[PDB]
Design an enzyme around this catalytic site. Structure first.
Site, PDB file in Angstrom:
ATOM      1  N   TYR B  19       0.650  -0.881  -0.032  1.00  0.00           N
ATOM      2  CA  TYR B  19       0.400   0.034   0.012  1.00  0.00           C
ATOM      3  C   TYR B  19       0.444   1.250   0.414  1.00  0.00           C
ATOM      4  CZ  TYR B  19      -4.622  -2.631   1.070  1.00  0.00           C
ATOM      5  OH  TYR B  19      -5.401  -3.182   1.410  1.00  0.00           O
ATOM      6  N   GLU B  64     -14.554   7.461   3.296  1.00  0.00           N
ATOM      7  CA  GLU B  64     -14.296   7.090   2.413  1.00  0.00           C
ATOM      8  C   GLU B  64     -16.109   7.947   1.489  1.00  0.00           C
ATOM      9  OE1 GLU B  64     -12.400   4.012   1.107  1.00  0.00           O
ATOM     10  OE2 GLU B  64     -10.223   5.324   1.539  1.00  0.00           O
TER      11      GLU B  64
END
Lengths: 159, 161
Positions: B19, B64
């Site tokens: 990531y 998000e």
């Protein structure tokens, strides 16, 4: 972890909201909310993830029957903590629904979270000052065992 | 905070998933996922809360367009991070929907989070090793500006950028 697990703490966020937490064991907390948006709310036997990030810094994270997500960091040596709480929209809109001894109303919380709106979330990220900290031992079922009331935190601090 | 804002990092989980994050400024990140269940997903201009908890320990938290909530801690001097991600049920069942340049599909993410199941959520807490760390400076729009591809993390480390 043995320095953190068993801690009983009271802290006031920078928005003025006063909270009380008991790290009952390495995967469970009880807590009691004394002021702010959901003052009066209290909870026992909340399953949590607890990790030590590095010397003196711990993290406690969980999700609730209301849908709220929480990630707290504690810095006990500095008597500071930081919390981020991700409230579903409906909790911000109707905080009264969640203000109770949650254990008696789990079904109501889950019913509400499916029936009302979640988005956009109301996210509250704040530091707090720890004003009471005591190693109360592990699995003491009597630490957090009644609803909060006016003056309770002073009583706890006064001993 | 000035030691942390502007950092470009890759962190790698025990399973090998990589990531990538760029702390673009004191309230914004870009990120890019290179492998795993949502490999290919990338995001620019995500508004975040960033705080310094104590010396060498930072916290980056946000929600998000998909409904996912995230709280990451970074310990750069120990080259470690810990993340907890709270995924809506639907992201667990249809992760592929979230694999895209999110900025081009905000409407799709929001349609999805309303159309599909939110609960029960999946709470996913895990440590990772920081395997790349470079101060890239602040508000550099060129750091994360394209979709990931196989080998890109190697290119980042080899090109120091």
């Amino acid at each position: 972890m043995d320095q953190f697990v068993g801690l009983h703490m009271i802290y006031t966020y920078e928005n003025g909201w006063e909270y009380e937490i008991y790290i009952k064991n390495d995967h469970t907390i009880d807590y009691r909310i004394h002021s702010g948006m959901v003052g009066g709310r209290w909870v026992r036997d909340q399953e949590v993830n607890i990790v030590k990030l590095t010397k003196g810094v711990y993290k406690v994270s969980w999700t609730e029957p209301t849908g709220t997500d929480v990630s707290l960091n504690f810095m006990p040596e500095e008597k500071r903590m930081h919390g981020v709480i991700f409230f579903p929209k409906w909790v911000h809109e109707r905080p009264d629904i969640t203000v109770c001894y949650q254990n008696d109303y789990i079904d109501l919380m889950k019913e509400s979270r499916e029936k009302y709106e979640t988005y956009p979330k109301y996210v509250v990220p704040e530091f707090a000052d720890i004003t009471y900290i005591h190693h109360a031992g592990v699995n003491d079922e009597t630490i957090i065992a009644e609803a909060p009331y006016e003056g309770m935190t002073d009583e706890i601090r006064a001993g």
